[PDB]
Amino acid sequence: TTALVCDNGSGLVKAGFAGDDAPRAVFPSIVGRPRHQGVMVGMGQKDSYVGDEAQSKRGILTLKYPIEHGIITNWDDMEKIWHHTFYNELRVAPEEHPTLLTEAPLNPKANREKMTQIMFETFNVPAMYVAIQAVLSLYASGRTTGIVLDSGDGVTHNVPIYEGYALPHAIMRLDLAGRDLTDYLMKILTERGYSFVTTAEREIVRDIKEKLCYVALDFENEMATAASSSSLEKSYELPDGQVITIGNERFRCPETLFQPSFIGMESAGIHETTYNSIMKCDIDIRKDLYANNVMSGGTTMYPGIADRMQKEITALAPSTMKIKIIAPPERKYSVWIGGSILASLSTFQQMWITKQEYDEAGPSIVHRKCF
Amino acid sequence: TTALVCDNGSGLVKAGFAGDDAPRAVFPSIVGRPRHQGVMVGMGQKDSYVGDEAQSKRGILTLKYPIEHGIITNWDDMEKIWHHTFYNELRVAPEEHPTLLTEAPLNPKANREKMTQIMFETFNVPAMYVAIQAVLSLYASGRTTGIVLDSGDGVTHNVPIYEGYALPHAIMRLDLAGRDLTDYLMKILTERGYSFVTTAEREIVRDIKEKLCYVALDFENEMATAASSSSLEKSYELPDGQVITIGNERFRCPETLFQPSFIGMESAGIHETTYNSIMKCDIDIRKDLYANNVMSGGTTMYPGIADRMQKEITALAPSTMKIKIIAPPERKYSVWIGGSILASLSTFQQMWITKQEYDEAGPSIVHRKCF
Amino acid sequence: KILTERGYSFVTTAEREIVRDIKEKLCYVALDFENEMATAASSSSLEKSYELPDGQVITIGNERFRCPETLFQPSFIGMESAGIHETTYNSIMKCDIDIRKDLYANNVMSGGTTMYPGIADRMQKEITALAPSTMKIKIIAPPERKYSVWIGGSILASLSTFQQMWITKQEYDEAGPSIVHRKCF
Amino acid sequence: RAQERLATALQKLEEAEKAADESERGMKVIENRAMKDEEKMELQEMQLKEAKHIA
Amino acid sequence: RAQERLATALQKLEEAEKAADESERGMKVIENRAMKDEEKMELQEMQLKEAKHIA
Ligand SMILES: Nc1ncnc2c1ncn2[C@@H]1O[C@H](COP(=O)(O)OP(=O)(O)O)[C@@H](O)[C@H]1O
Ligand SMILES: Nc1ncnc2c1ncn2[C@@H]1O[C@H](COP(=O)(O)OP(=O)(O)O)[C@@H](O)[C@H]1O
């Protein structure tokens, strides 16, 4: 029977069946609860919406992502998310379906452990497995070498892989991702007079970011340009009319990824961490890594990000090295695609963790090579 | 020569000369206009009073604060306010006096720009400068570290400063302040049969708030107490006799600052935003920030607010950290005091914005490090 | 790195110093890695707490001896070279055969990284396992060894038979910075 | 001179591609707006029709 | 190899310039249609107003 591929991530849950071509159901991984009291008896309002239901009821709810930076903080909301996924989005009894789960590298081992435990106890799957998002993203790109730069909504990691071997000592996790960009945009949008403070209108700001923002090939030139002309201003319709306009912000916001100082962080920019991860690997495999910079995750979907990325990492690397950047047009779902591909193997059908084996060895089994 | 220090704020304008010990002139920042027609000819009634004059003519006017939440909305009333200040409260020709102006953090840049422009054109000062209210409030307390919680009449911000450096990414502005408390008190005063709706009697309610309200060290206990006994009721005589009494309200009103849900806002309470601003700061400087919670602004003048604040922020912080709350007895004017201190320096006498320089570079100069 | 897997995240160059303090206080070398791993798995007699500069005490267990174990298994950080004991023994074996007994007997140890509780005993065990059985293995680990370099430097500089090995300003002006590699060493 | 003219070709290619693609974003948004105004005309001429009807 | 990548830079340069030329007379016709939609939205908005008023 088929396996399920549920890629949790932050911001967006992506689920589907192994062997399909795209995740069947995709919805925001949020949980909302009403924050007023309600007066119409007989309306039978439930006590907590979830997913697109909440995304539609935003106006009267308080939304709380149960995953902060790759880690799961509120376990009850996470279980609600999973249950809603299985029983509504896919409408499938999870008792007869091995499920594939993903997580970023360098996470609290308790996270993965409790994940396994809840999966086997509450939902009672027959088997399961936890995979590293970046490996799956490489699978989905038909590569077998090259460093991958996943950048979802919560975390941003580089994983250099060569011939299917991973160099763990060169993995570079960094906690700057789409949520941080959304917040920085909320902040700099004040200096025009626009004030979004509610957890609801954070979603509005996220939409504004996904629509109007883009990466500038040269920051100073774009700044001077937006100063001189006004050919960069674009408007936007809020959910109640009152069109707004943003100029400089459009490219100031995603610029953070290259200058994390904008939000007070100290770590180096995306290009810098990539180049450092390269330099940590052995010298014989650096040319291929230069040639195969895969990119996935929704945050790497900015108009112009690949060109700026290539420009920078070219400025850093030697001149006799060919820099290339593999940025497919569907890269947002590359992790789920790679997960489907992997779970569809048969040489993989003996890497699962069987319910019996779990009962025999307890949640500590995950860290064992039943990985 | 002497420098002027005008701290606009909402609710209260307070001005004076640099180097002094207290603002010379202090009056409400309102503008009134008659709303009836007037029948006695030769009375020569002017068309718009301002300041204490309007506060006295309340009975027949309509008052309109020209500053809503730290931002200036009606620029003509603001110019009237400034002109009245210079020419009647101080009796000073502004042509030969560098002036210091204040504004909250995270304001529309157009606000500060137009401020500079009007200052240089209408009043034609020789120089000026705009400062952040919280920095001045720290100056006035002899500190050089510690977070400051200013809360005036319109806005409420925390600015963590350490060793003279400000960490802007941890600034927390919140638009709940004295005006909102006044409105909430106006609302809950109805449930005793007292109805204040006019812009005049809003001032009556403001006085009631400044006299009878106080923060309760424990909300539930005080509620149960006021339910059981009646030792909390105090009376108050309106401008036409008809003494009124309030019980529960006295501490229900300022409780909002800790439970903004009372007025439908979603943000977290004062203690919560403070603790969050701390936690956003680097770990090595958190102990000092814990030890130096400065307070300022009129809204932090409720009897008991410092004790309740310490109780809460102690409940949030680790146990081995010393919580202290610097609440001077004159903190209402801490911003003006710090402004006088700063303007009186000489190492500051080269940070002004000279009119020549402005004519050279236009109002865009303010955002430039001529800050 | 390995402190992440408990949920503690230190990334700033500032809090690298915090981590260094944690390392200097809690870590230690384990006489037998596998036994200590199994022990920390079974019991909890190895966990120790630590208070950060803002309270919020943390606890580390297995890490206390996982961290300094690297020196003997550099593969933990992806390096390929051999462990400390191994390079020591190799350096011995490269020397002439007539002087190997004394070298076995006089393993001096200095520098702050050799200040781990238990490092000398584990070091002795390993290098004993490598060396023949009829050779006496000793490890000179003074209690002030963190400053042994400076101490020896003061000793040498205080000599008089050394007062003619200096490089004089005049001499350097005469022969340029290339003088250092010359026997004015 | 090979490498200098190659660098010229690179920068020219790149900036021209960015210009083409920003005009491509513009064409996307203007096709959207065109369909928008289309259904706008539809619905508002239609309310004009029903206005004439009840008129 | 200098001659090789020179030739490649040359050709790809001119073909990408031609692609930008396609995209840019496309951008010309789309801004023409932008003005088309401007005047259409204007006329239809006006008639919407008169429809509402007469109705
Ligand atoms: N077109 C876009 N441009 C810029 N950012 C985007 C775009 N689409 C999505 N994002 C950002 O990417 C995030 C989704 O990334 P995703 O891969 O779903 O993260 P995760 O792997 O944690 O689920 C969203 O939070 C959004 O902010
Ligand atoms: N004794 C008091 N108790 C409680 N609130 C007060 C008291 N005195 C003044 N306030 C409130 O504080 C406000 C004055 O604060 P202020 O520092 O003047 O604000 P701003 O900095 O915007 O001028 C007034 O609007 C009033 O509502």
Side-chain angles (χ1 to χ4, degrees):
Chain A
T1 185
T2 56
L4 273 67
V5 171
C6 166
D7 178 72
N8 297 310
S10 318
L12 282 179
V13 162
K14 308 178 269 301
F17 291 98
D20 273 1
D21 208 359
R24 162 174 275 101
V26 171
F27 58 101
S29 88
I30 62 173
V31 178
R33 296 189 174 75
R35 69 185 176 90
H36 310 85
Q37 81 285 38
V39 306
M40 282 189 173
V41 307
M43 261 293 312
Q45 291 95 10
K46 76 182 65 45
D47 75 330
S48 86
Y49 311 87
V50 58
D52 269 339
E53 189 91 22
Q55 188 73 276
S56 177
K57 297 291 183 67
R58 286 184 308 193
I60 53 185
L61 309 191
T62 178
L63 320 180
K64 280 204 287 299
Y65 300 74
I67 295 172
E68 279 320 313
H69 299 110
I71 70 182
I72 312 183
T73 73
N74 187 338
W75 275 105
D76 285 318
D77 296 3
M78 193 73 246
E79 165 183 336
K80 272 190 218 170
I81 287 280
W82 275 334
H83 164 101
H84 167 273
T85 298
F86 289 160
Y87 293 84
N88 314 140
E89 296 297 331
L90 296 192
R91 265 166 284 95
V92 60
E95 296 80 343
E96 63 280 33
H97 287 84
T99 69
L100 198 61
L101 296 174
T102 76
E103 75 160 356
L106 308 183
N107 262 350
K109 299 204 300 189
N111 179 17
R112 157 184 297 193
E113 261 168 30
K114 186 147 179 42
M115 203 193 299
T116 296
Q117 160 173 343
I118 290 174
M119 201 55 54
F120 272 137
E121 311 309 324
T122 311
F123 297 100
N124 188 35
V125 307
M128 69 158 293
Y129 187 84
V130 175
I132 307 309
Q133 312 215 312
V135 177
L136 304 193
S137 192
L138 203 47
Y139 265 106
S141 176
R143 303 305 162 92
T144 189
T145 65
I147 75 167
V148 52
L149 187 148
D150 178 284
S151 160
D153 184 88
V155 73
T156 301
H157 45 285
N158 298 324
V159 181
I161 312 196
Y162 183 84
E163 301 298 320
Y165 293 97
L167 319 175
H169 62 81
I171 297 186
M172 315 268 300
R173 171 166 171 159
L174 164 61
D175 276 17
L176 170 56
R179 202 101 56 90
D180 296 332
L181 300 196
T182 295
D183 293 332
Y184 182 50
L185 181 60
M186 279 169 75
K187 217 187 77 193
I188 72 183
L189 261 187
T190 47
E191 71 197 22
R192 291 224 182 205
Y194 313 130
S195 49
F196 312 109
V197 288
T198 309
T199 45
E201 58 196 4
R202 180 176 295 171
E203 306 303 325
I204 300 182
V205 172
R206 181 177 49 74
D207 292 333
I208 294 181
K209 180 195 53 157
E210 284 169 354
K211 288 198 177 28
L212 309 187
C213 287
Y214 71 94
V215 180
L217 188 54
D218 199 343
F219 194 56
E220 316 295 344
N221 305 158
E222 292 272 330
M223 189 71 49
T225 292
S228 89
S229 89
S230 88
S231 46
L232 293 192
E233 298 194 356
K234 300 186 62 176
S235 288
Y236 185 93
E237 184 95 14
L238 291 187
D240 69 325
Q242 55 184 39
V243 57
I244 78 181
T245 81
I246 63 173
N248 207 354
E249 296 76 337
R250 300 187 43 207
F251 61 97
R252 277 178 57 203
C253 169
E255 174 67 10
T256 290
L257 298 169
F258 304 90
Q259 299 178 15
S261 86
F262 284 1
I263 60 166
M265 294 199 47
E266 197 199 7
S267 65
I270 282 305
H271 55 287
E272 290 258 14
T273 75
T274 282
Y275 170 70
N276 294 337
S277 180
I278 304 280
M279 300 312 296
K280 283 178 189 163
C281 316
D282 298 347
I283 193 181
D284 283 18
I285 76 180
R286 276 173 208 170
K287 170 150 63 46
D288 298 334
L289 297 189
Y290 281 132
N292 309 333
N293 294 319
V294 194
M295 286 179 48
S296 89
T299 317
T300 57
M301 213 72 102
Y302 286 97
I305 181 169
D307 308 307
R308 165 77 169 276
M309 183 77 176
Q310 167 165 3
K311 164 192 195 314
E312 311 277 15
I313 189 176
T314 305
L316 284 175
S319 46
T320 64
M321 277 297 134
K322 301 316 172 207
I323 303 307
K324 279 155 39 204
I325 286 185
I326 308 312
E330 80 300 349
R331 65 180 92 99
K332 182 188 299 184
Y333 312 97
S334 294
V335 172
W336 188 92
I337 288 179
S340 88
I341 283 178
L342 188 144
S344 301
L345 295 202
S346 63
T347 182
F348 176 64
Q349 302 302 311
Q350 67 286 20
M351 322 292 300
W352 299 94
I353 299 171
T354 78
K355 172 81 169 74
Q356 170 272 337
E357 187 175 1
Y358 175 80
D359 301 317
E360 167 182 345
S364 86
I365 186 59
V366 201
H367 314 308
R368 304 189 208 174
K369 299 292 98 178
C370 274
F371 191 70
Chain B
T1 175
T2 55
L4 263 59
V5 169
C6 171
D7 176 71
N8 307 295
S10 315
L12 281 179
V13 165
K14 45 198 92 78
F17 289 90
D20 274 12
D21 208 358
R24 158 162 298 118
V26 163
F27 60 101
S29 87
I30 65 182
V31 178
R33 296 188 174 76
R35 65 189 178 91
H36 312 94
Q37 77 283 38
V39 308
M40 291 208 167
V41 299
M43 199 54 185
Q45 312 107 357
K46 74 181 64 45
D47 73 331
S48 67
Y49 313 87
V50 58
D52 272 332
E53 169 77 59
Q55 188 75 269
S56 164
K57 298 286 200 62
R58 274 188 322 203
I60 55 179
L61 306 192
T62 177
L63 315 182
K64 265 178 297 183
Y65 300 77
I67 300 196
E68 280 320 310
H69 298 109
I71 70 180
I72 309 178
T73 70
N74 191 345
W75 274 105
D76 285 316
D77 299 0
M78 195 71 246
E79 167 177 338
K80 277 193 217 171
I81 286 279
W82 276 334
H83 163 101
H84 166 273
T85 286
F86 291 160
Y87 290 74
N88 316 134
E89 296 299 328
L90 295 194
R91 278 81 52 84
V92 61
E95 294 75 359
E96 64 280 29
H97 284 87
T99 63
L100 197 59
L101 300 170
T102 64
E103 78 163 358
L106 308 184
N107 263 349
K109 302 208 299 186
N111 168 39
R112 152 188 294 190
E113 268 171 25
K114 189 149 175 41
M115 191 143 57
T116 295
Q117 161 175 348
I118 291 173
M119 203 53 55
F120 276 131
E121 309 312 319
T122 305
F123 299 102
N124 188 40
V125 310
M128 52 145 288
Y129 185 84
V130 174
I132 306 309
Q133 310 218 314
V135 179
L136 309 187
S137 178
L138 203 48
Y139 265 104
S141 176
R143 303 305 163 94
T144 198
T145 65
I147 70 166
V148 50
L149 187 147
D150 180 283
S151 160
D153 183 273
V155 73
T156 299
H157 45 287
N158 309 339
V159 182
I161 303 188
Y162 180 89
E163 220 63 22
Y165 293 95
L167 320 178
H169 62 81
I171 294 186
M172 302 280 285
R173 172 169 168 158
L174 161 62
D175 273 15
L176 163 65
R179 195 99 53 84
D180 295 332
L181 299 196
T182 299
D183 295 337
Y184 183 48
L185 180 61
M186 269 168 69
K187 194 178 81 175
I188 70 178
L189 264 187
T190 52
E191 71 196 22
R192 292 218 178 200
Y194 308 135
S195 74
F196 307 114
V197 289
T198 306
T199 45
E201 58 195 5
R202 166 187 320 278
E203 303 302 327
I204 299 177
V205 171
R206 183 177 48 72
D207 305 357
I208 292 180
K209 179 194 54 166
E210 287 170 358
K211 281 186 185 36
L212 306 190
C213 282
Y214 70 94
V215 184
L217 186 52
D218 200 351
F219 194 60
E220 309 303 333
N221 306 157
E222 284 267 306
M223 187 74 44
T225 294
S228 85
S229 89
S230 88
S231 63
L232 295 192
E233 302 200 1
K234 297 183 61 174
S235 310
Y236 183 98
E237 176 168 3
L238 297 185
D240 63 325
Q242 50 182 10
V243 58
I244 73 179
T245 74
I246 61 176
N248 217 340
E249 296 74 342
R250 303 185 44 207
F251 60 97
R252 276 176 61 207
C253 168
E255 174 68 9
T256 292
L257 296 161
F258 304 90
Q259 298 180 14
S261 78
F262 284 175
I263 59 168
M265 293 205 49
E266 201 203 16
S267 42
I270 284 301
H271 56 287
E272 285 263 15
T273 80
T274 283
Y275 168 73
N276 293 338
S277 166
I278 305 282
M279 298 313 295
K280 276 190 218 145
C281 285
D282 188 298
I283 190 183
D284 289 330
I285 75 176
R286 279 172 205 171
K287 172 151 64 45
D288 298 333
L289 297 188
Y290 279 133
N292 302 255
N293 309 348
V294 191
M295 316 187 83
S296 85
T299 320
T300 57
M301 213 71 85
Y302 289 96
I305 183 172
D307 318 307
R308 167 77 173 272
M309 183 81 173
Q310 167 160 0
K311 166 189 191 314
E312 312 279 11
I313 193 182
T314 306
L316 284 177
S319 63
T320 65
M321 276 296 135
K322 302 315 172 202
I323 303 308
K324 276 159 35 204
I325 292 185
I326 310 311
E330 79 289 16
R331 46 182 179 268
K332 179 187 292 184
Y333 315 95
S334 294
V335 175
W336 188 93
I337 288 179
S340 82
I341 282 178
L342 191 138
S344 68
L345 300 179
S346 58
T347 183
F348 177 61
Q349 299 303 317
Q350 68 286 19
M351 320 286 299
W352 299 93
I353 296 170
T354 79
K355 173 161 173 56
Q356 172 273 338
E357 186 176 1
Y358 157 88
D359 304 316
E360 167 183 348
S364 88
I365 187 54
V366 197
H367 315 313
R368 199 164 316 161
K369 276 325 284 179
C370 274
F371 201 69
Chain C
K1 202 173 84 196
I2 64 170
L3 265 185
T4 50
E5 68 196 24
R6 293 219 173 202
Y8 313 131
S9 81
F10 310 111
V11 285
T12 303
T13 50
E15 60 196 4
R16 180 176 295 171
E17 304 303 327
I18 299 181
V19 170
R20 181 179 47 74
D21 305 355
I22 291 177
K23 179 195 57 155
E24 286 168 353
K25 285 188 182 27
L26 305 188
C27 294
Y28 72 96
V29 187
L31 193 55
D32 202 335
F33 194 60
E34 317 296 341
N35 306 156
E36 285 256 353
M37 188 72 51
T39 300
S42 86
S43 89
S44 88
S45 45
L46 295 196
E47 293 181 354
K48 298 186 64 176
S49 289
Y50 184 100
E51 178 168 2
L52 272 65
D54 69 319
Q56 56 171 21
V57 62
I58 73 177
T59 64
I60 68 176
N62 197 4
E63 295 78 325
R64 301 184 43 201
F65 58 98
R66 287 246 308 286
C67 165
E69 173 67 14
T70 296
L71 296 170
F72 304 89
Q73 300 176 12
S75 68
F76 284 179
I77 61 168
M79 295 200 46
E80 168 169 340
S81 47
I84 284 303
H85 58 279
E86 198 89 31
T87 72
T88 283
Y89 169 74
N90 294 334
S91 170
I92 300 296
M93 301 315 295
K94 286 176 188 167
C95 297
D96 294 344
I97 188 175
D98 285 19
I99 74 174
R100 281 172 200 170
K101 172 148 64 46
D102 298 334
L103 296 184
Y104 282 135
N106 306 333
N107 293 318
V108 190
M109 282 188 22
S110 88
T113 319
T114 44
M115 198 68 74
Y116 285 99
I119 180 159
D121 314 310
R122 166 82 169 276
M123 187 74 183
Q124 166 158 4
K125 177 169 71 78
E126 312 278 13
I127 188 183
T128 311
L130 287 176
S133 65
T134 85
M135 284 294 124
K136 298 318 162 200
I137 302 304
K138 279 157 39 202
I139 287 183
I140 309 311
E144 82 304 340
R145 68 178 92 97
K146 190 197 288 183
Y147 311 95
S148 295
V149 179
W150 187 92
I151 287 175
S154 81
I155 281 180
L156 188 142
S158 68
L159 293 203
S160 70
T161 182
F162 176 63
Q163 305 303 322
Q164 66 286 21
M165 323 288 301
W166 298 94
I167 301 168
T168 82
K169 175 77 171 70
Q170 172 271 336
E171 204 167 5
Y172 154 87
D173 300 315
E174 163 185 343
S178 85
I179 185 57
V180 201
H181 313 311
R182 305 188 210 174
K183 286 318 309 171
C184 274
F185 196 75
Chain D
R1 88 275 184 273
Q3 52 78 33
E4 62 87 20
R5 77 208 165 193
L6 162 65
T8 73
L10 303 161
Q11 52 82 16
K12 186 59 63 179
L13 271 149
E14 170 43 51
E15 274 287 350
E17 275 157 311
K18 182 187 185 184
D21 306 350
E22 56 87 14
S23 42
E24 160 56 39
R25 315 166 206 172
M27 74 77 58
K28 275 186 296 295
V29 309
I30 188 59
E31 301 297 340
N32 310 327
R33 296 164 32 156
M35 314 325 151
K36 295 329 182 324
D37 182 26
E38 195 52 43
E39 71 250 7
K40 288 172 216 140
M41 295 182 259
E42 301 180 9
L43 58 93
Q44 59 202 313
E45 286 143 359
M46 171 48 224
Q47 56 80 49
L48 177 66
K49 308 305 166 283
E50 50 90 17
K52 297 146 164 171
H53 287 86
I54 50 169
Chain E
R1 275 77 55 93
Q3 282 107 35
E4 304 163 25
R5 91 284 186 272
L6 160 69
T8 69
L10 287 158
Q11 50 200 356
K12 288 142 62 65
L13 186 69
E14 289 104 15
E15 289 106 17
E17 291 158 352
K18 172 196 184 180
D21 297 0
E22 303 145 19
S23 296
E24 74 188 2
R25 90 281 181 275
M27 89 185 286
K28 188 171 197 166
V29 59
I30 68 157
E31 52 85 13
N32 301 322
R33 307 167 323 103
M35 310 328 287
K36 295 182 192 75
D37 287 291
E38 299 294 341
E39 49 87 15
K40 288 159 208 308
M41 86 181 54
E42 167 184 345
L43 201 153
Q44 268 63 238
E45 266 290 337
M46 297 303 106
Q47 59 86 359
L48 182 151
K49 260 83 80 177
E50 288 104 16
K52 284 296 172 288
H53 309 131
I54 288 294

